[PDB]
């Protein structure tokens, strides 16, 4: 008993003009455009009950692949940062009638190695939980801390870090007013956790492949080229 | 003016035993094995003074390379663990007429992508540095602190957080006394400078590429398979 869920996947930040340096959403992974491949994560599970991507609206690359003529995925318009975007996205699903009490996922665009047992391995630990929870893998290189000028203070206690990926999954009411005060509180958002952070939750860490990485430059397409099929 | 250094490159640990699933040394990478692009490094170097590999006695790989018959690579035998070997390297130098003031430059066998301008930022930094130094990279990721029941219990504050890489440049008789007494101290020694922090000393940073990576997952290979030449 998977409990139905929703996905925002924020895409936005891409320019108008085609780049010879793509937007890494949008680079080759074995004849499918990364952004592509992370759709299919999502779009075959059976308690998925809608999926929207946020995109800038004069994106050039996403009218020339497959899923922007699918009526599986849904499309919602880019903010000024990330948060925006996401927080444009629950709008979104609020119009295609998703409940203030509905999960609510939001994962990278550029994870497109996300497997189907992390995806139900979160969902069945986060169910029943009063706030949500994120995927996450344990810290596995040695952690030091600079003091100020630049000399090791201590090597951090590495057993209690953990590396934040995504999905994160957490309610679309909370996650909603969270992301809205974070806002115009000022807080430095990075992912949804940060925001419920600040809101006073305690998310919690499900423990997630290590290889559900983020594609951050061309080189780390090269580690999942032979992930596909 | 760089200073003259003496390498110590730990890769004991090996059985004696070949096995499919080779230790990670010994892979290819595009056409030589790991570890002999991690001696590529060092050896070319005009301030080297001479290097060690630290090896089982038993190692069925090394005699196979190239490089087990060059009078450019001396040989040590391994330790109990990582830093027993090491400490035989040490000794090793000391037959070879190091003294107790000349830097000691220790590196991961699994790091042959340490490009040249790398080990000489850390020769020009740690040159007159009182205890010495190691590569090392911005944490780059979210980091999550976890509660004792999985949740997040804080955001760590990521800007203070570097992920510790090799080469470690120490002077050598402090880095002998360091390892051998935190080896009968029962100290968890990680890498040299854990143990010059548990004698006291504070390590500096001196940041290097990220891509700078230890092989340890074949998939790791991947990622370098196009960074040679
Ligand atoms: C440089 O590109 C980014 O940082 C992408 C980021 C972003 C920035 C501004 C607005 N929306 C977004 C969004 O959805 N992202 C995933
Ligand atoms: C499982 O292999 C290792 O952890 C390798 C390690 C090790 C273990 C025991 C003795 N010496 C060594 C050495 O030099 N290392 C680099």
Redesign the interface.
Known sequence: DLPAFWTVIPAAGVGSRMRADRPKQYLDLAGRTVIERTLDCFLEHPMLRGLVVCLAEDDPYWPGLDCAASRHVQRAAGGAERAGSVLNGLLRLLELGAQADDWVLVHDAARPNLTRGDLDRLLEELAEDPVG?LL?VP?????????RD???????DRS?????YTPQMFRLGALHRALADALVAGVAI??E??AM?WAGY????VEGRA?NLKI?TP??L??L??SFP
């Open positions: 929870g996450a810290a596995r290189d040695t952690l030091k801390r600079s003091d630049g000399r090791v203070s201590e090597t951090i209690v870090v953990w590396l934040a990075t992912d956790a940060s952070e305690a998310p919690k860490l290889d951050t080189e780390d090269l580690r080229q032979r």
